UniProtKB/Swiss-Prot annotation, chains A, B, C, D:
It holds the Pfam family Abhydrolase_1. This is Non-haem bromoperoxidase BPO-A2. The gene is bpoA2. Residues 25-263 form the AB hydrolase-1 domain. May be a chlorinating enzyme involved in 7-chlorotetracycline biosynthesis. It comes from Kitasatospora aureofaciens (Streptomyces aureofaciens).
Length: 441, 441, 441, 441
């Protein structure tokens, strides 16, 4: 798969990307000189843990186009921007490794955290690698980087070999934490990047990210290997944490630069924990928003108390007997049959286990759009559009452009499994409906 | 990026290509069994020297499609034709290495040199490799080539190994001029070409190019390694130069077949020397053409003598005091303010150094399209199109479709730096303007 | 030229008007029985002094329609209203002579001073001409005016003769301050007004303007001839100044009623003195307003202090070395290149002398709309509309309907002299831009 | 009637014009400070002699608008251009008197003689009135003109009096060649021009017309009064004739500047002669063009000889017996009935006297469009458009856009007097028809 990010002469500039799983989106931004596939140990864990995994190959690397332009962090951040906008990612986690940590800082800094729930920096460049008068903690002098450029231009093929040596601490880790075959694959991946990008990349490494850091808005993780020969932990992660005290901070004891493979565990467990903390809060946010919309249609009173208590309990995960819940709703006075259908729908959708219970007649009758063909026609039209939605707000926005009869019919269509959409999209549908109905009062 | 060159059964035949830099187009045609990426040492130099670099992968190789049809030099030349026409290349240099030198000869021969400024043959097949009665200087008998085909069909993978041995003179050059890793990359590239192309390619090697050579119209370079084990310099470059005495001719002392890598600097230097001469000639042509258009609007007389002398001098590179030049123009009688603005524009554009001189009021006033909004509207439209142009003639052609008022306004727009285009495109703009104005007289 | 002010039976009622020069609008309202052309000595001076001169012929006079309705000051003031609204006059000076001074008072009184910067009363009717019990200072009894009406109805032609006698003090001024031919022209003008208007006009002369005077809001001038036989200075200008002490007050020694011609230089000088003060105040206001908009985009701090000081100084007329000013701006830290371009533009526009300095590259680059063709397209569209504007607010209003990119491009267009607009219109453009940019923050 | 020539602030600039008679257009351009009505003695003669008379009032004079802009010969010539284009005048005579002679020279010079058959200069400004070093024959120094401006600004009313004195040589001509009443009317006309134009006009009088004169392409007349006190014949007409030897040249013995009235006879007789010479040639041109179109449809042979002889004779004015002519045509073999109808039409149209002969059945039958309703429908449509045409080429151009059936039907419509058009328009119709028919062969 490709996303086009620009044009170079007669050719467009396309980034290779992958898009796996379902759930909260996690975007992984690889390091030099590798590709999105270098995250494969992390991707597997995130997929098992229930996240949507997005990887892409930076321009000049892996399967992306290989221009001779745009090798700088503003372009790289603009590239990332295009990806996020193209996929309409909401509530995303951005995880960068090495070079990738430059994208994370520069994007957050320039474009803000509108789509972004949390960030993570692994084997970071930050805050500035260039050793100057005003930057004493810098890791190396300018002449040092000039050196790498010269070395890559001389042979890049040979260069990759010595690079992966220190990248992986092969003198320590070969035959132990990394196989000879895994290293061979890495070299092949590097050899496959563009010649121009290979020599141009090292010039972006001493980008000054010092003014980007105060812009970091959302929860952050900083993770570094203490045996990092490529980015000395003392000039990078340790001074970065002083600049962002707020960041959660993890040192991987004796881990090299290429800790994604050698210490995938410690990485994946820690990354997993970070996702886990981010994910539950996001889920809670989703649950409570739904609740306000659902409650907005119910008349104020003690019933509205019983209903809200029940929502909150199933939302907290207390598996309730849906059969008991549904009978209660069914037999509630005052509530309109429409209202009971909406609640009926919400509860079956959110309850931990449906326990093989059949659909309820009172709900099917409540959500049938009065069996009106125009309602049903529009509901089918909305359904088509909702299949393309992946977020709560996108779903809710498109739904609000339809009449309440059509919305109720659409809900029946999903309820009865005549169509299927993602959970968060279904929430947006029922919330648009509640919004429309509440507004009629 | 791809260019489609044909159809095979249900599939189209697409050639992988790249398009880097800006300036005079240089098209690099790779050898067997490698791809456009084998030129990476040359590409870097050409890019630094300020050329537009085009590479593509021959059908059956690198990232191009892998048909089982069209393995012959007429098809290969037709493939090249499609590339050149698709990109609308003007004033291009064609550089072939090994197999690629067959494309260069056959295209020039059949399609002529309309788009082509110069040609270069590196490690050439020419003039005929087959040793016959009528071709005594041929390098080998037919049975020898029949042998290679049989060897590739037997194992191609194993075959590439012994091939790169002699291709690179690895017994001499390994660890010295070529690394083991660079060789590994080459084998990977070869292993990635199509099985059918691998066995079919060697049949095209003894194509008789003897009738193609007299067709070579434009300046040429012949370059060969004297240690070439693959194409014996005595049966190829040395008899080729006798057939084309006119060619500039360079022997690389003890260089193998794969001299692009092993002797890449020297090869790159040679390319610069040829590109540098071709570029200088092209620049001189551009100065000469621009000049005729510019002179066409001036009334015949002694002033027209002073003006032409001045153009020629700045065009020759005599850095003149633009401030002095501009005052002179400004104060010239007879010349219309329009004419003075056009000349004003040309001189600031072509003078070696502007010496931080501010724009001139007499020119801004002359090139303002009479402050007419429709002129300015069209000038902005033209500007958009000119941003996409890279050649003098393409620019001039599109410009001539606009009125003189709009053209003058566009020139003011560039003059005043409200927009930017490449130099040759700017020349096309001012020349279209002169052409339109001259035609009004 | 005509402005339609009403309908009489099958015919519309149209006022003849003229509209000359550029600059601050000055509206001249003639006396009985003459037309807008009676101001010709004043018009010439005002035109030379750099004002926009508007004249019109009151209904029933000169080249206006000659209805038999609407001969009263409310209608006359409504007529004037229609003129001012039709032309969208802003910041106008209203100058009335004789009858015209009734329009000035009644319009200001009823419609307010929204469009009006200053007023002038020459040979005024004010405050009330009718001699009554409650108006002891009145110039004549009712029976006296009844007399004039009767005289005009008897012969108006013969009547004009004796009228111009006292109107001009011909016994004193003929052959001296007024020629016989100038008097002949006056009679011809009068003979050309409508018969009905001639007899109906004198009934409007004893209109009580006593309640209109407290409504005079803006700076005023009262000017009267001490030899006025038509409107005794003692019953008119002298008691009017007591009612409006605030008015600037000028007696023309031995000047008759028709002092516009006989003492035209002195009257013209007086107009220049008032126009000159009003113009200077208006200019100061413009400097003050422009300044707030310009300052609104600059970050608060010491630089903002240096900038404001400089604006104020050039605005006060301290001719500053623009070259020095521009270098300072150019080299200022913190300020965005956009901001520097806007300031660059403002300073070159307001500095007393540009001293033949060329345009600055930093400004041209700052105001180029990013060389975007859509910006430039809209900027050209805006420019067309701005050519039709004559006021700061009209310009600013139309400009605010365009995006900031298009506005910046338009400014570059003017800066680079690719188009031209009046100064106040240019101010409106740069102020709309500042407003748009400030609002983005 | 008005023609709009521009815009001043909120008002358009309209020129008052008149358009009298039918025949060859003669455009009269008045002098300072008078209007188109000053030509009334000439207009009457030209109308009696059978010409179309066009007069207009220069901006600032007579009944034209009175702007404070555009008082210069390029604007005045542009004004004239607009008039000629607005009325689509073809084959026009331009006659200027005094100031008007500046329009004639400047228009011819800049716009060329495309619409213009002949020119006439009466009491000319030419070639340059300013007395300089390079212009020794100039009539006065710059300080002299500066003087007139100052005098007009001082009083223009009084000024006109002394001006008409010398304008008319009233000391010689009053009560003799000009009445006191005629002079009174002149002053009234002048007093009615705009104040601004009166003072601005004299600045245009020393315009250098020396480079305009070589541009005079067409037959010219120069006419001057030897008693001209306003434009000394020695600095104007006499040096002008040296610059244009080719001009027909007439001195009116002891005639003043205002010779149009005082010597209308000598003027009108001479002008009449000039028109008479121009008119006959134009008529001959019209006759011979018609003939080629008419002959183009006839087969080559002796009949074509008889026909051509006859056309030429009636065209030369030999009144022929149309009855005899028509019978001859009617009874001619070979000629198609269509052809006979066309000739029938032409002859009745061009014959001096029809002698009360009834329309011919053979022609009515020939020109009936086959009684086809679509033909007739289009013919009626064409007729509507032809009523708006006044020239041969305009008529012929619009006619050629119709089919031959429709054209023939239209001709029948005119032939049968069911509609009426001017002679030259009718010629264009029959010529378009002949052109269409000839093209079918």
């Amino acid at each position: 798969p490709f996303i086009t990010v620009g044009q170079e002469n007669s050719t467009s500039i396309d980034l290779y990307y992958e898009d796996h799983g379902t759930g909260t989106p996690v975007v992984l931004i690889h390091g030099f000189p590798l590709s999105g596939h270098s995250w494969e140990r992390q991707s597997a864990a995130l997929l098992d843990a229930g996240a949507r995994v997005i990887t892409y190959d930076r321009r000049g690397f892996g399967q992306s186009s290989q221009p001779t332009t745009g090798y700088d962090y503003d372009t790289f951040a603009a590239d990332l921007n295009t990806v996020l906008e193209t996929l309409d990612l909401q509530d995303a986690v951005l995880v960068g490794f090495s070079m990738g940590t430059g994208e994370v800082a520069r994007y957050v800094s320039s474009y803000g955290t509108a789509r972004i729930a949390a960030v993570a920096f692994l084997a970071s460049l930050e805050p500035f690698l260039l050793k100057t008068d005003d930057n004493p903690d810098g890791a190396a002098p300018q002449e040092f980087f000039d050196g790498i450029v010269a070395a890559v231009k001389a042979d890049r093929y040979a260069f990759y070999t010595g690079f992966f040596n220190d990248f992986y601490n092969l003198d320590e880790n070969l035959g132990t934490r990394i196989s000879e075959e895994a290293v061979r694959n890495s070299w092949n991946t590097a050899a496959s990047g563009g010649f121009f990008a290979a020599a141009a990349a090292p010039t972006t490494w001493y980008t000054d990210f010092r003014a980007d850091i105060p812009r970091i808005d959302v929860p952050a993780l900083i993770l570094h290997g203490t045996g990092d020969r490529t980015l000395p932990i003392e000039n990078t992660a340790r001074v970065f944490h002083k600049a962002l005290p707020s960041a959660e901070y993890v040192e991987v004891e004796g881990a090299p630069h290429g800790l994604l493979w050698t210490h995938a565990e410690e990485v994946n467990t820690a990354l997993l924990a970070f996702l886990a903390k981010a994910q539950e809060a996001q889920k809670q946010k989703l649950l409570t928003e739904v609740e306000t919309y659902v409650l907005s249609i119910i008349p104020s009173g003690p019933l509205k108390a019983e209903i809200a208590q029940r929502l909150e309990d199933v939302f907290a995960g207390k598996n309730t007997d849906l059969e008991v819940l549904m009978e209660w709703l069914k037999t509630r006075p005052i509530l309109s049959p429409l209202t009971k259908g909406i609640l009926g729908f919400v509860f079956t959708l959110t309850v931990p286990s449906e326990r093989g219970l059949q659909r309820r007649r009172f709900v099917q009758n409540a959500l049938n759009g009065n069996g009106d063909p125009n309602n049903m026609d529009k509901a089918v039209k909305l359904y088509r559009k909702l299949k393309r939605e992946i977020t709560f707000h996108g779903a809710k926005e498109i739904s609000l452009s339809y009449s309440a009869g059509a919305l109720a019919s659409c809900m029946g269509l999903i309820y009865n499994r005549m169509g299927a959409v993602t959970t968060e999209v279904a929430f947006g549908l029922v919330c648009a409906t509640c919004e429309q109905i509440a507004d009629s009062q």
